[PDB]
Ligand binder design. Sequence first.
Ligand code: HEM
Length: 154
Amino acid sequence: MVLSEGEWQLVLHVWAKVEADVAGHGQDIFIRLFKSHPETLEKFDRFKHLKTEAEMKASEDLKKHGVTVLTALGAILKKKGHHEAELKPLAQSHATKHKIPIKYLEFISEAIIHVLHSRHPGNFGADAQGAMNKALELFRKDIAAKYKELGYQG
Ligand code: HEM
């Protein structure tokens, strides 16, 4: 799949808002993920003891993790589809060290979309949401392809 320039512009316009508070958006997204799909929490040795939303909000390590994750994702989005080199180390650690199934990348995609919809309604109407969905689908398809090359394709 291929996004048009106009679709990329919608994606990077709302992402520019996210980047005004990377740490805050990172927290909301991981809390949404962990609350909606608790099984995902089990993949994180560092966080799986966290029992409540309050504990998650107070965790300094989870906040730092969320910043690392959104920073990596933002670098990929700003490539506008030319992201082969960025995806390679990411695919390798998630396939063979962390062991993250493609299904869980769909779950975090839904969490990102929910949080942008809640925080940026004026910059995230239906066309912008359609464009971000397409960007994230592109990301997932290209990581699934690398997963297969690396021997996991989980
Ligand atoms: C937008 C999707 C994602 C991005 C951009 C992303 C990015 C990252 C980055 C950059 C790191 C640190 C370096 C590394 O180990 O490669 C990381 C670590 C990790 N990722 Fe993700 N990731 C994503 C989705 C997920 C999902 C959905 C899960 C699990 C449900 C996951 C589980 C992990 C784990 C277990 C670590 C190690 C954390 C630690 O103990 O320090 N990732 N991820």
